[PDB]
Amino acid sequence: SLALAIAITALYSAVCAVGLLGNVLVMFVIVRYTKMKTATNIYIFSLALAGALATSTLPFQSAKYLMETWPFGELLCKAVLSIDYYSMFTSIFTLTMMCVDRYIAVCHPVKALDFRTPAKAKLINICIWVLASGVGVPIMVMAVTRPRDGAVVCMLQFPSPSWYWDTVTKICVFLFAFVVPILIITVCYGLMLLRLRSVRLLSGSKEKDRSLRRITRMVLVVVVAFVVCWAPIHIFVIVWTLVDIDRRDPLVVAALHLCIALGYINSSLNPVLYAFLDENFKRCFRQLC
């Protein structure tokens, strides 16, 4: 019981620390050394910024878990929920546009000359943040603070029936944040891998086949990590919304915090991993060392 609590608090603290420091280091290396020439590095910078914004939310959640009540107030409750949803949608849309950019780069090379420019990539990223603000505003409006059973809880207030609009909201978030990006990324990467076999440099030799294996593994790790991290929290939250059972039981809450921790790991740690997968990012440290 007590060890479970301290273990979950240590997990949140470790994820917050490593994610925030990694995102700050990635943004620092991108600004100082790369200078945002490549459009892909601009996308990585936007993804790291969204990951750091998601990472910032975690200490308030850990403090609420330890205190077992919310003393921070309604306005900060609104800020926490708005930043959480805004950062999540920004990160997912940025990753989807990264995969679309790689698809357009490989499969349509003549079109890529016109399409891929730093100014257009910056415009697309600014449009992503502005459209994510449209998601962010109703979460800020709906969020309220109410006292329940002698304790204060931060939550979202839905219009009547609350369960129905809550369920519709969870299904819409599940659909647009999970199913459509997996579809776009899987189709783009599949067509990209089908295109890559024709290339003479990637075929006809053992070393070339090993290079194709490396490219295939680096491509598929993104899809595998995205599915593995996002699916349990979405499924558990939908089941939580449908079932009416009390949250007094510690084990179910602990599993819920593990799923939330996996979602924040995908939000924060995986942009750092995507940055480390880049050969140029390795090359900068290799030249420096």
Binding site: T38, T40, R102, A105, V106, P109, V110, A112, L113, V199, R200, L201, S211, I215, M218, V219, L277, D278, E279, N280, F281
Partner: peptide
């Protein structure tokens, strides 16, 4: 044309950093 297309795909893969 095909060889130039292969060179451009190679350059784009190097630019993305996968290759």
């Amino acid at each position: 044309f095909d060889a130039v297309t292969d060179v451009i795909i190679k350059n784009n893969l190097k630019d993305c950093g996968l290759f």
